[PDB]
């Protein structure tokens, strides 16, 4: 289970538990992303961007 964050190729292998992953893109604009990394699930998602979350690998 490993995960690639905002674009080069930085990918990691997440943790037991953390085997979800997640990119969270602005919702201000269309989908800007600035935000990614290991986690278990999605954190409260607000009103203006959006938490791009997932189980995948290199999904975010």
Same mark, same amino acid.
């Given at each position: 289970?490993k995960c690639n964050?905002?674009?080069?190729?930085?990918?990691?292998? @997440? #943790? +037991?538990?953390?085997?979800?992953?997640?990119? /969270?893109?602005?919702?201000?604009?269309?989908?800007?992303?600035?935000?990614?990394?290991?986690?278990?699930? @999605? #954190? +409260?998602?607000?009103l203006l961007i959006?938490? /791009?979350?997932?189980?995948?690998?290199?999904?975010?």
């Amino acid at each position: 289970l490993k995960c690639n964050q905002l674009i080069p190729p930085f990918w990691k292998t @997440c #943790p +037991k538990g953390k085997n979800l992953c997640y990119k /969270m893109t602005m919702r201000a604009a269309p989908m800007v992303p600035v935000k990614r990394g290991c986690i278990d699930v @999605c #954190p +409260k998602s607000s009103l203006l961007i959006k938490y /791009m979350c997932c189980n995948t690998d290199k999904c975010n």
